[PDB]
Structures are given as structure tokens and as C-alpha cells.
Amino acid sequence: GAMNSSNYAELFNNDIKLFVDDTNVYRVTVHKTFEGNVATKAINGCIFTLNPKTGHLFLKIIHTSVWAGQKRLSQLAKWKTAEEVSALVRSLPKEEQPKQIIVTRKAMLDPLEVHMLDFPNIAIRPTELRLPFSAAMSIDKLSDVVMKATEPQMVLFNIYDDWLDRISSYTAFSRLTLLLRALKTNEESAKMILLSDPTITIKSYHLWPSFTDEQWITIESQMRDLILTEYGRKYNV
Amino acid sequence: MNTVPFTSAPIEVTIGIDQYSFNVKENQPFHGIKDIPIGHVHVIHFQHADNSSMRYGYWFDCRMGNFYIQYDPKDGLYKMMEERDGAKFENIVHNFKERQMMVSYPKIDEDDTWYNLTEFVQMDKIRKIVRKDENQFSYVDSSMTTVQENELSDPAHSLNYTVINFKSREAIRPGHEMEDFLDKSYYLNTVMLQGIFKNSSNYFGELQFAFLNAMFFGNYGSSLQWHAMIELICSSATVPKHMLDKLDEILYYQIKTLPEQYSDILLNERVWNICLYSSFQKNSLHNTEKIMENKYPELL
Ligand SMILES: Cc1cc(OC[C@H](O)CN)ccc1Cl
Numbered sequence: 001g002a003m004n005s006s007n008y009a010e011l012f013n014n015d016i017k018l019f020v021d022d023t024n025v026y027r028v029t030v031h032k033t034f035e036g037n038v039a040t041k042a043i044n045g046c047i048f049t050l051n052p053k054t055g056h057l058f059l060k061i062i063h064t065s066v067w068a069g070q071k072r073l074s075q076l077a078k079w080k081t082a083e084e085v086s087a088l089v090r091s092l093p094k095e096e097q098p099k100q101i102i103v104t105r106k107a108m109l110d111p112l113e114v115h116m117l118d119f120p121n122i123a124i125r126p127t128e129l130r131l132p133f134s135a136a137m138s139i140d141k142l143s144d145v146v147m148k149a150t151e152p153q154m155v156l157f158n159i160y161d162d163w164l165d166r167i168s169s170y171t172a173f174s175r176l177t178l179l180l181r182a183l184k185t186n187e188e189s190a191k192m193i194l195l196s197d198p199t200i201t202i203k204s205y206h207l208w209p210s211f212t213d214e215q216w217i218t219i220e221s222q223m224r225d226l227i228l229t230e231y232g233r234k235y236n237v
Numbered sequence: 238m239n240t241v242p243f244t245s246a247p248i249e250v251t252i253g254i255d256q257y258s259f260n261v262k263e264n265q266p267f268h269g270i271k272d273i274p275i276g277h278v279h280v281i282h283f284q285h286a287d288n289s290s291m292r293y294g295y296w297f298d299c300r301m302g303n304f305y306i307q308y309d310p311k312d313g314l315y316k317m318m319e320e321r322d323g324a325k326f327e328n329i330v331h332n333f334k335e336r337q338m339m340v341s342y343p344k345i346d347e348d349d350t351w352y353n354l355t356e357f358v359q360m361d362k363i364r365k366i367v368r369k370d371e372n373q374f375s376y377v378d379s380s381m382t383t384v385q386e387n388e389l390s391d392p393a394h395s396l397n398y399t400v401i402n403f404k405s406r407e408a409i410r411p412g413h414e415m416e417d418f419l420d421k422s423y424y425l426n427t428v429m430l431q432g433i434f435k436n437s438s439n440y441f442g443e444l445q446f447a448f449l450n451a452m453f454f455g456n457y458g459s460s461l462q463w464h465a466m467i468e469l470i471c472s473s474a475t476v477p478k479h480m481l482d483k484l485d486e487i488l489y490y491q492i493k494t495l496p497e498q499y500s501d502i503l504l505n506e507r508v509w510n511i512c513l514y515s516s517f518q519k520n521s522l523h524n525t526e527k528i529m530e531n532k533y534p535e536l537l
Contacts, residue, residue, distance in 0.1 A: 079415035
């Protein structure tokens with residue numbers, strides 16, 4: 001069934017599962033035409049497919065050329081996501097295929113279910129969590145590879161860097177969601193927090209800075225503070 | 238005109254014949270129904286005075302034999318039976334018609350209701366949905382489940398309606414996932430009509446049989462089947478023009494005949510709002526949309 005506060009720990013058991021977020025697949029700028037009408041111009045997008053246990057991220061880059069000449073693009077974006085997720089599963093060895101795929105928005109259920117009819121033993125599930133995966137394009141290296149792409153492309157990341165060498169996947173996913181929630185609520189502040197000290201760097205093969213354990217506790221406290229405030233600043237409390 | 242004689246009426250019961258019904262008292266001198274129109278299927282159905290649970294009844298065609306009812310006190314129900322001895326049948330029926338112990342099938346000469354509800358229904362196809370090949374008539378009741386329901390448990394006592402499933406490999410061609418799921422014309426026209434039903438008359442016939450079993454027996458799986466078949470048409474962009482016009486008439490007479498107090502359980506809000514207001518065929522069911530809006534605006 002649906003994923004919520006109460007069945008949270010299933011994410012970290014040893015049944016393979018993937019989160020699929022489609023919120024960055026179809027992305028536009030809205031602008032005015034010479035005649036004073038409004039028009040959209042599409043920009044490159046991405047499917048965010050994540051193994052929350054391992055941290056393996058399958059970033060499928062959606063090049064604008066896939067919208068050329070198509071109508072009802074928001075609807076087509078959901079089926080394109082499902083097609084791409086399904087092709088990903090099919091590309092994987094059987095023992096690497098997921099047993100569940102959890103979609104972050106309910107409109108993906110029917111497109112994915114139809115594309116996955118061939119995999120009756122893979123459960124497609126929604127969630128009631130308000131997960132911040134839309135903020136993934138606030139991660140500079142992910143944003144960069146998406147905007148530079150000239151053709152459809154899949155890029156593999158580990159969105160936890162090396163954290164798992166020191167912390168559990170429960171703790172890693174909690175850190176990840178805290179970081180993304182912060183970036184979603186106030187991107188400038190969140191990014192200031194992460195890079196303030198120039199002596200903490202991002203390895204070439206990583207997405208986030210090389211914080212010590214002690215530095216992560218401080219960072220995490222600053223992200224919490226940020227998030228509580230922006231909630232005051234927004235509701236005046 | 239034909240006759241369904243009864244050996245007696247030992248228990249109080251409401252008897253229905255087609256869209257008509259009358260109350261018979263315990264051990265009332267009642268010997269059956271006369272004047273039944275030849276040329277249509279018919280259904281004779283029963284609700285016991287004691288136990289409103291289990292409405293039940295028998296689909297039959299009088300051209301296919303001489304049929305009678307007799308209450309079985311072991312099994313506790315009015316059973317349909319066939320008298321092969323045509324001479325014994327004429328003689329028995331004549332005597333009752335003489336003693337005027339039969340109610341007359343009360344058709345109004347203007348009234349084409351029953352024809353319009355059964356236009357495409359044929360006994361031969363009923364007998365393939367209700368499998369009991371020794372008899373020429375078919376028993377249905379409120380509790381019988383459908384073949385698709387048993388997949389989600391007695392196969393002998395099931396309604397073998399054609400399985401329709403919009404999220405199935407049968408309905409979705411590889412490489413046309415989105416196309417086929419948003420526009421079911423492939424599934425309607427090639428898979429079902431051309432493939433399974435052969436023609437729209439067999440399709441419509443199953444649709445009408447499903448509705449009638451939902452309405453007379455409150456058979457839940459039949460209502461599911463009726464809605465599913467409506468939805469497949471309305472969700473198809475490409476539908477022959479003659480089928481749309483006929484569907485509008487079919488549904489029109491179904492909605493007209495539905496008991497007003499039963500609409501809350503027999504009508505699926507989602508399917509009807511979708512068919513009448515969202516689907517490819519939102520503008521193609523004028524008669525159906527007009528009667529639904531005037532008679533059940535609450536649902537929409
Ligand atoms: C009313 C009726 C009764 C009947 O008696 C059946 C008995 O079991 C005798 N075989 C036969 C035909 C008809 Cl139509």
C-alpha cells in the first residue's frame with residue numbers, strides 16, 4: 001500500500017526498492033511573445049530514481065528534443081517517465097531488479113503500472129510523505145549534467161557520497177532529506193550553509209562537501225534552524 | 238403467446254416476470270403466467286416473503302421448450318423444469334386457463350420497454366455465460382460471482398462474462414502503452430469486437446444481460462460488467478457510428494427502467510460522469526445524457 005510515517009523503516013530493509021520522482025522531467029520557462037502573448041520554452045529535465053538503501057541514483061536526463069511536436073506535454077511527461085523507468089528495470093539483471101517502486105506523486109501510478117505489466121511481481125506504490133526530491137536540481141553537479149546534455153543520457157551517482165562507510169542508510173536518508181528540504185525552502189541560505197567554510201571541499205567524485213562527523217552535526221543543526229525559521233517567516237510565528 | 242404454468246404456490250413470494258411483479262400468498266390458488274410474448278427472452282424471478290435475501294430466477298425462451306415451476310421443499314425454492322411430454326403440457330395448461338388460475342402477462346400495446354431492454358439478448362449466449370448445459374433455461378441469483386471476481390470460488394455456479402481489464406496485456410499493445418490506455422479503440426475494435434464478440438450485437442447482448450442481472454437480482458458482479466462495457470466504448474475515440482447511436486438508445490431504456498430507489502447502489506458515479514462529461518463520447522449520448530440529468534442529477 002501507501003508509504004507513510006509508520007512504515008518508514010521498510011526503506012532500509014534488504015528488499016530492493018526504488019523511489020521515482022517525476023517533478024523535474026518536464027521543465028519550462030514562461031515568457032512573453034512579440035505579440036504580447038505568453039509562451040513556454042522547455043528546458044532539459046531529469047527523472048530522479050533512487051535506491052534509498054544504497055544511495056544509487058539513476059539520473060535519466062530528458063533532453064528537450066523529446067517534446068518536439070508533441071501535445072499535452074505534462075501528461076506525456078508521466079508516460080515518458082514510466083517508459084524510461086521500465087527500460088531501466090529491463091536493463092538490470094534479474095537479481096538487481098526492484099521488488100517495489102515507490103512514486104512520489106500519485107499521477108505516476110497508472111502510467112508506471114501499464115508500462116510494467118510485464119513485471120507483475122514488482123509492486124507499484126504511492127506515498128503520503130512530502131519528500132523533497134524536487135530540490136535535486138539544486139545540487140550543482142546534478143543540475144550541471146542536466147543542463148549540459150545534448151542528447152538523451154543516463155548518469156549514475158551515489159547521492160550519499162561515502163557516508164555509508166560511517167552511518168546507516170536510515171541516517172543517510174534522513175540527512176539527505178534534511179539537506180533537500182532545506183534547499184527547497186530557502187535555496188540561497190541552504191547553499192550558504194554548505195559552502196561557507198572554504199576549507200571544506202567537495203571531492204571530484206562526490207556531490208557534497210567532505211564534512212567530518214562533528215561538522216555534519218553542526219551543518220544538520222543549521223539546516224533544521226533554517227527550516228523552522230522559513231516556516232515562521234512564512235506563517236509569522 | 239406462451240404459458241409458464243406452476244404446480245402450486247406453497248410459500249408466500251413476490252413473483253416477477255420481466256419488468257412486472259405481483260405478490261402471491263402462502264398456498265394461494267395460483268397456477269402461473271399466461272399470454273407471455275413469443276420472440277423475446279424472458280426472466281421469471283422470486284423474492285420470498287420471509288427471506289428478502291437471495292432474489293433468484295430463470296432466463297428462458299418459450300420457443301426452446303415447455304417450461305413450468307413447482308416449489309421444491311427440500312431445497313426451498315421455486316424451480317424451473319421442462320415437460321418433454323407436449324400432450325401432457327397442453328392438457329395441464331388448458332385446464333388451468335379454464336379455471337382462470339393464471340395471471341396474464343400485462344403488456345401495454347404501446348409499450349416497447351421489454352424489447353428495448355432485450356434487443357440483443359439471445360438465449361444461446363446466456364447459456365454460455367451461465368453454464369448448466371442439461372437445461373435450456375438459466376438460473377441466476379443475487380450471490381453468484383463472476384469469472385473475473387473468482388480471479389481476485391465455485392466455478393460451476395459462476396457468471397462467465399467476458400473478462401475486461403484496462404490494465405492488462407490484452408488491452409495494451411507493447412510500445413503503445415500510453416496510446417492504448419488513453420484511447421481504448423484498439424481494445425474495443427480489434428481485441429473485443431473483432432476478436433472475441435465477432436460483432437456489436439453480441440457485445441450489446443452481454444451488456445444488456447449484465448444490466449438486467451444487476452437490476453433484477455442486485456448481482457454486484459453483473460453491475461461491474463455492465464459499467465465496464467459502457468466504459469470501454471466511451472473511452473474509445475474511434476467507435477462505429479451505428480454503435481454509438483444504438484448504445485445511446487440501449488442505455489436510455491436502462492436508465493428509464495431502473496427503480497428510482499436503487500440508483501445509489503446500481504450506478505457508478507465515476508463511470509457515468511466520465512462517460513457523459515469527459516470521455517471521447519461525451520457528446521454522443523444525447524438521449525442518455527438528457528434522461529440521466531433529469532432523473533438522477535444528484536449523481537452527477
Ligand atoms: C405444471 C406441470 C406439472 C407436471 O408434473 C410434473 C410431475 O413430476 C409429474 N411428472 C408436468 C408438467 C407441468 Cl406443466
